[PDB]
């Protein structure tokens, strides 16, 4: 399948070169997979989600996304125009308030929720969790992410936006989950992207067009935007039968575009998420 005039990050994920604008993918499009977006919520009514999004949990007075961040991330995973896996099922878990903040205890509860809740859902091709969130190092937050991964969920987490070593942030620093840095449309490390040995992969994160609340769209930047490219890619590859939840981060690194990014510090992987889709 070909999507013309695609956001640059979707074209980049299906390309061996920067500078193209068509996204190419197998028409299976993550059907039969599930992605949990653990964030500020998802505006499930947005036409871009086509009824494939729903809120399953909130820790606040509403399940609605009063911020936009979670809607944007969910759009990069699985919206019809802005998404990597255009037929996945999206489940929203609101651990972040409408100011985009959340207590670590709530984030942990939301991870343990997804590990159980997947057993209430139909995801024959597998389960992914996308965590465009984090804060300072916490062994308890890393452990929660490790449990979720162990339970059979492909966990993708943002490296963080401090232009620093991600070893000092959680859940970025958890070794067993997929930690995602951000790049720009010229294959440079995004200026804000964390780096370090705990990164597994880079995905598009500068100037990413996706869904927003009020049935709208906008372009924003962050390792928050790179993470759902990888979460969507995992869901797509799991539907194709190419990998499993336990091995998808490894598989994505194995099949990445290698050595194409600039301003990658010595000792950080130079790997850019790639779907290796051949028509
Ligand atoms: Cl809910």
Swiss-Prot record:
Obligatory cofactor(s): Ca(2+)
GO process annotations (BP): proteolysis
EC number: 3.4.21.64
Residue intervals passing through the bilayer: none
One Gene Ontology cellular component annotation held by this UniProt entry: extracellular region
Binding-site residues, Ca(2+) 1: 175, 177, 200
Catalyzed chemical reaction(s): Hydrolysis of keratin, and of other proteins with subtilisin-like specificity. Hydrolyzes peptide amides
Entry keywords, A to Z: Calcium, Disulfide bond, Hydrolase, Metal-binding, Protease, Serine protease, Signal, Zymogen
Top-level taxon: Eukaryota
Catalytic residues of the enzyme: 39, 69, 224
Keyword Disulfide bond recorded: yes
Cofactor binding note from Swiss-Prot or TrEMBL: Binds 2 calcium ions per subunit.
Binding site for Ca(2+) 2: 16, 260
Family from the record: Belongs to the peptidase S8 family.
Record-given protein name: Proteinase K
Species of provenance: Parengyodontium album
Recorded name of the encoding gene: PROK
Full-sequence portion shown in this chain: 106 to 384 of 384
């Amino acid at each position: 399948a070909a999507q013309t005039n695609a956001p640059w990050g979707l074209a980049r994920i299906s390309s061996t070169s920067p500078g193209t604008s068509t996204y190419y993918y197998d028409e299976s499009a993550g059907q039969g997979s599930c992605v949990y977006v653990i964030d500020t919520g998802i505006e499930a009514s947005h036409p871009e989600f086509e009824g494939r999004a729903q809120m399953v949990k909130t820790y606040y007075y509403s399940s609605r996304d009063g911020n936009g961040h979670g809607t944007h991330c969910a759009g990069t995973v699985g919206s019809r125009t802005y998404g990597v896996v255009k037929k996945t099922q999206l489940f929203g878990v609101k651990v972040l308030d409408d100011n985009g903040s959340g207590q670590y205890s709530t984030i942990i509860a939301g991870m343990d929720f997804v590990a159980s809740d997947k057993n209430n859902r139909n995801c024959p091709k597998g389960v992914v969790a996308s965590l465009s969130l984090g804060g300072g190092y916490s062994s308890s937050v890393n452990s929660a992410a490790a449990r979720l991964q162990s339970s059979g969920v492909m966990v993708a987490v943002a490296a963080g936006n401090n232009n620093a070593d991600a070893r000092n942030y959680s859940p970025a620093s958890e070794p067993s989950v997929c930690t995602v840095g951000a790049s720009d449309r010229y294959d440079r490390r995004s200026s804000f992207s964390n780096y370090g040995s705990v990164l597994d992969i880079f995905g598009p994160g500068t100037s990413i067009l996706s869904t927003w609340i009020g049935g709208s769209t906008r372009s924003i930047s962050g390792t928050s935007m790179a993470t759902p490219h990888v979460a969507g890619l995992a869901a797509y590859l799991m539907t194709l039968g190419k990998t499993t939840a336990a091995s998808a981060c490894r598989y994505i690194a194995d099949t990445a575009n290698k050595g194409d990014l600039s301003n990658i510090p010595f000792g950080t992987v130079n790997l850019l998420a790639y779907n290796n889709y051949q028509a």
